[PDB]
Design a protein around this ligand. Structure first.
Ligand SMILES: Nc1ncnc2c1ncn2[C@@H]1O[C@H](COP(=O)(O)OP(=O)(O)O)[C@@H](O)[C@H]1O
Ligand SMILES: Nc1ncnc2c1ncn2[C@@H]1O[C@H](COP(=O)(O)OP(=O)(O)O)[C@@H](O)[C@H]1O
Ligand SMILES: Nc1ncnc2c1ncn2[C@@H]1O[C@H](COP(=O)(O)OP(=O)(O)O)[C@@H](O)[C@H]1O
Ligand SMILES: [Mg+2]
Ligand SMILES: [Mg+2]
Ligand SMILES: [Mg+2]
Lengths: 86, 370, 7, 204, 370, 370, 7
């Protein structure tokens, strides 16, 4: 079951290499009953309402990217002046 | 307008990109009341942050969230950032990208924690994180040189080149403003003044900023101070008492150049700067000598420019030329440099966008902004 | 003492 | 051994993974994660920043999962073991064998072997020898105990997916689990304090 | 309709919450006859409490159930409360909460029996026990200041800064108006007037309340009183005799500042307040010097405010500005401050309910009241 | 032989070099009669010094010339030393050198006047001043460790790696036996006992010396005392009354490890030991941990050594081992260490000759002694 | 009081 709206992503480090020896490999019946309990408990519904992310709110140069930083630093005193003045 | 928030051990400066002075400069402390409250209905808060804590510091236990440049309490650090945006600046970070400042040789854990905290609790649209020492030279207007970054945390000497920090040449130094403040009260007890509590530590810091100075010659000044009372100055405590310091004026700042007073084997800031330069390449050694810039509040003592120049001249070869650049705005050099970088048109390229953060995760901070 | 405490 | 043979800890870990996978994108629907990823829970907040993911995990556990209500008393040795430095204990203990091994060559064939240079009133030889045999018997016990701890710790590490070869992981293994435990207890304490006071206000 | 009862060593003021003046004020004395009645027609009682005892004070043996702010006779204390509720206020305490006052640094058993008696003999719905000095600051409307509450048995100073009290700086002196009354009748024998019986003590107390005053300069006024007769005043006894008291007018209140006259080693009230301020931190001393508050009937002598200002100014640093607040209604400051507390909306969550007392017992007051 | 005078805040010990015990041990109090002499048969001296004042402490105002290890009144200190040499030791100071003791981190004027008084009033041939904590280590037959001294005025932790103490790692707290005595009488009023005057202060000190003890687990012991009995002890006052103290037995010594009860922000006696060790080199920390030495009368409580070991173990890393050394005669450890130092043949060149003082004045005490 | 004073 997937949520209808995008929610906060809870990133992890994943598992080192693969599931070669870790206990995550074991398909014990104890893990199975957790999935069915969560699918029936009123938990997944609450996650969509409360943990919805706040959208995103976003806000031809031949010149070298590195040298762009340098020029603005040295000539910071003439930001308000046009190149014709400089 | 991109916010430029420069967190620090002693004071945190916040403002807007393009301004020539920070809008809010308040102490970075989080105090909590140690006495139970008897007056009901006052609505007293649980924790006081910033200027509110300093005003009521008599009945509070002031704890600095940042000690020696590492945040020992990540719960109080969120409190200060919350106070910086909503209260002091009165601007919601929802529509303003935030620029943060790191410290030289910062652990990777702090780098990701800062990104994770702000991108979720405050969910700012964009972020960029830069080194404090790197921004210090940007404010002065030169991109190549060696910065003698000092403050209330740990003294750093970062010989940056072409605007990039050299990782191997960075030398650390624990001698900072807090050590001198702790050393000042240790030698002030010789005259009969006993400052011990954290509330009275702020009082000693006021004395250090107003009366302390660096003497050009230590041995000559010591004899003059004992013989005559000209060097003595009077200071008034908040309770009305008047104190007098005779030779502690040039003995507390002198600990910077002679760390053996505090019992530290490491050399002074005069020798650490020379040692850092030697670690760099031979060809670029000429440029760094003539473009050394002091920064931070610790290097604001009167006469520190002359004492540093004289002492580093003897250590350096006679062929080398010494030019200690000490701009008068060196207290806010870190913040001013950040405002210059933020206002750049090309600065939009290396934003850490909110959309990009989700797909990559907190690990994007290591590779995107370095 | 002089400034601080009583001594 | 207690952490490896604890079904409560595994069940709680399984519950978190399912909750995390529900929110995560379809392209990052991982079936496992390292222990160090448990620190991301307190840093996620809701719209009003009142509660975290760990904060709501307490209510969910104490409403539909009574088995995992309180695991702190069940796993107490983990908290105590977090205060010990495994690398320091290994370095300290292994130094003792080096001293004992060097002592044997000194007493049997070293400077102490020759009794001619010894003073007549020098009972060092008559004291070291009775203790050396007794100490050797105690010495083999320490050597066995060192390897037993190393084998159990390494076995309990690959079970949880941690890298045993990394020196960083060996030092910070129980502390990471302990860090999650104190975070859970603080969240549970905050949850009880906020909810119970609200209920009391309504009743009065 | 919370009841605010302020039981004191000499007088107990009882009224209602939300009012501006106490409803009933009567002396807190319980007297019983020392003779045997001869007329059977008169409806003589066993003991007289309140203003009734004062009217017939010539026959009874007046006894104070409260001594030095400590109830030394719990059998008599119940009589006063029984007389207060059912005769003065004429209300049933079974429906209104009761607010009580107690001096600081009192025995823990004193407030334990106060809770038990009312909750079992009167069955009050709720309770709260507050410090007398804390309530005095509520009447003034301030939030920062050292309160000197000199009453009839206890003279105590409680410094409060921004609503947070300092329990370690609280000084209590067992010297108040009752001890001055005992000293006044001792020096009145130097002129030829002998007051010994407990009934005649109330006559001396009337003399002190009208003629005694605090001299600005005791050494100067002593010489003046011995060289002329302008300071002499005439008082009329209840029996018609006219007595004249001279230098005793400024000598009885002088024992407050120089307790060596009484044989006590404790410092004066001016030194006790200064010692209390010195125990506080340096940062809060400036705000406590300019917010000194006097209260209680003992501090009603003409000129005590001026004398206290001069005495503290000598001890305090010259730079500080001492400002003593002497409101005209400082006699009922404790009760008026308690009226505001009971009427506050926030205070409704701090009542000691009957259920809370039932589960624990008399010890609940320790953890729920300061 | 050289006299070894160890002036202390509470008691002063004087004797001879080479002896195993001080010859005279009397309290360091000077009292003056507040009452007026009425009879003429006896001498009725102006002031009484030492145990003479203790016997007649009822009619005197006992004043301590030393507070927090600083001589506040130099007029009374001359009385005590004149009493030590001429009444207790009954020797002429003009023939024997005198060794004195001064607490670390003291005002320079404190030990400057000591030199002036010795060389101008008693005309001693030689003099020397030594740190109190340093001598405490010599009495235990050690030259490498940390000494936890605690008396009436000072509780200083001086880590001594070699024959000379480490100056940069010395921590001094103004919390000692006298502070606990003032706290004991503050919480004794909760049971109904009032001790106010200085004469009654000496009664409280006797109670503290005999009944107070340090609890291994403060939280567990408080619950045990809540069940009543099995912990209350009866003490007999000089008047004749019998008083019983319950939880006050361990509450007063608990103020050492939790100074928050006294309203002091300073850390406890267990944390200040760990903090002092952390200021030393990494190599030396191993020796200081295993050679902790207690001294002074404050550390003579039953069970303080056991409680201190548990607290340090939790703070210190588990790899290090903690061994607290508590010699049976730690009350006189300061004097015994001084006796060993004076009897040494090498120490004969460290004396300050009379001619040496004349050429440099009192200022020679800073340069020569330590 | 009990021990000390009269109260
Ligand atoms: N005028 C001054 N003279 C001497 N010292 C100063 C002066 N101003 C500030 N300081 C010291 O510098 C410290 C401020 O450090 P700061 O530069 O704010 O740290 P950061 O670099 O982390 O922002 C203060 O603790 C103070 O002791
Ligand atoms: N006008 C006055 N001037 C001087 N002293 C007074 C005056 N009125 C009352 N007193 C003294 O104050 C004492 C108690 O007054 P009060 O403060 O009303 O008692 P309580 O402290 O119990 O409220 C009395 O013993 C009396 O001697
Ligand atoms: N047996 C004891 N138990 C508890 N405390 C004691 C004991 N003996 C002495 N003290 C405390 O030690 C203090 C004096 O100790 P000491 O160091 O010998 O004198 P000083 O502190 O003047 O150098 C006294 O104030 C007393 O409170
Ligand atoms: Mg800085
Ligand atoms: Mg009153
Ligand atoms: Mg001592």
């Amino acid at each position: 079951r997937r949520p209808t709206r995008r929610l906060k992503q809870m990133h992890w480090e994943k598992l080192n290499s693969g599931l070669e020896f870790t206990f995550w490999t074991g398909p014990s019946d104890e893990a199975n009953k957790i999935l069915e309990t969560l699918h029936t408990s009123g938990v997944l519904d609450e996650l969509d309402e409360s943990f919805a992310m706040k959208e995103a709110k976003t806000l031809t140069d031949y010149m070298s990217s590195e040298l762009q930083k340098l020029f603005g630093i040295h000539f910071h005193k003439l930001s308000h002046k046009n190149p014709n003045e400089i | 307008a991109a916010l430029v928030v420069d967190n620090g051990s002693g004071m945190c400066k916040a403002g807007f990109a393009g301004d020539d002075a920070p809008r809010a400069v308040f102490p970075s402390i989080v105090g909590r009341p140690r006495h139970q409250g008897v007056m009901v209905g006052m609505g007293q808060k649980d924790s006081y942050v910033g200027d509110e804590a300093q005003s009521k510091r008599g009945i509070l236990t002031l704890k600095y969230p940042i000690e020696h440049g590492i945040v020992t309490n990540w719960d109080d650090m969120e409190k200060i950032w919350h106070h910086t945006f909503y209260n002091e600046l009165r601007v919601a970070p929802e529509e303003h990208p935030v620029l943060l400042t790191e410290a030289p040789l910062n652990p990777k854990a702090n780098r990701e924690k800062m990104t994770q905290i702000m991108f979720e609790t405050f969910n700012t649209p964009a972020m960029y994180v830069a080194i404090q020492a790197v921004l210090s030279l940007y404010a002065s207007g030169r991109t190549t040189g060696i910065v003698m970054d000092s403050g209330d945390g740990v003294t750093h000497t970062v010989p940056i080149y072409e605007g990039y920090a050299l990782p191997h040449a960075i030398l650390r130094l624990d001698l900072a403003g807090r050590d001198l403040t702790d050393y000042l009260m240790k030698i002030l007890t010789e005259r009969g003044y006993s400052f011990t509590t954290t509330a009275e530590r702020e009082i000693v810091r006021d004395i250090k900023e107003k009366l302390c100075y660096v003497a050009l010659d230590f041995e000559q000044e010591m004899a003059t101070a004992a013989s005559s009372s000209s060097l003595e100055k009077s200071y008034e405590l908040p309770d009305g008492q008047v104190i007098t310091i005779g030779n502690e004026r040039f003995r507390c700042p002198e600990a910077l150049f002679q760390p053996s007073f505090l019992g530290m084997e490491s050399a002074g800031i005069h020798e650490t700067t020379f040692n850092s330069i030697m670690k760099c390449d031979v060809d670029i050694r000429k440029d760094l000598y003539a473009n050394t810039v002091l920064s931070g509040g610790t290097t604001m003592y009167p006469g520190i420019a002359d004492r540093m120049q004289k002492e580093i001249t003897a250590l350096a070869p006679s062929t080398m030329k010494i030019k200690i650049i000490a701009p008068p705005e060196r207290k806010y050099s870190v913040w001013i440099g950040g405002s210059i970088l933020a206002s750049l048109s090309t600065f939009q390229q290396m934003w850490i966008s909110k959309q990009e953060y989700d797909e990559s995760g907190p690990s994007i901070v290591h590779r995107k902004c370095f | 003492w002089x400034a601080x405490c009583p001594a | 051994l207690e952490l490896r043979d604890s079904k409560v800890f595994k069940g709680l870990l399984y519950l978190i993974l399912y909750l995390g996978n529900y929110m995560n994108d379809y392209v990052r629907q991982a079936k496992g994660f390292a222990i160090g990823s448990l620190q991301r829970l307190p840093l996620i907040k809701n719209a009003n920043n009142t509660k975290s993911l760990l904060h709501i995990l307490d209510i969910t556990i104490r409403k539909h999962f009574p088995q995992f209500d309180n695991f702190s008393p069940e796993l107490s040795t983990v908290t105590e073991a977090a205060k010990l430095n495994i690398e320091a204990i290994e370095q300290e203990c292994s130094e003792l064998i080096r001293g004992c091994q060097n002592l044997q060559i000194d007493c049997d064939s070293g400077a102490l072997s020759d009794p001619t240079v010894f003073h007549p009133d020098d009972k060092i030889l008559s004291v070291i020898l009775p203790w050396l045999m007794e100490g050797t018997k105690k010495m083999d016990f320490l050597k066995e105990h060192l390897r037993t701890m190393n084998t159990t710790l390494n076995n309990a590490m690959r079970y949880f997916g941690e890298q045993p070869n990394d020196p960083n992981s060996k030092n910070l293994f129980f502390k990471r689990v302990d860090s999650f435990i104190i975070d859970y207890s603080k969240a549970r304490s905050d949850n009880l304090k906020s909810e119970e006071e609200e209920a009391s206000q309504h009743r009065r």
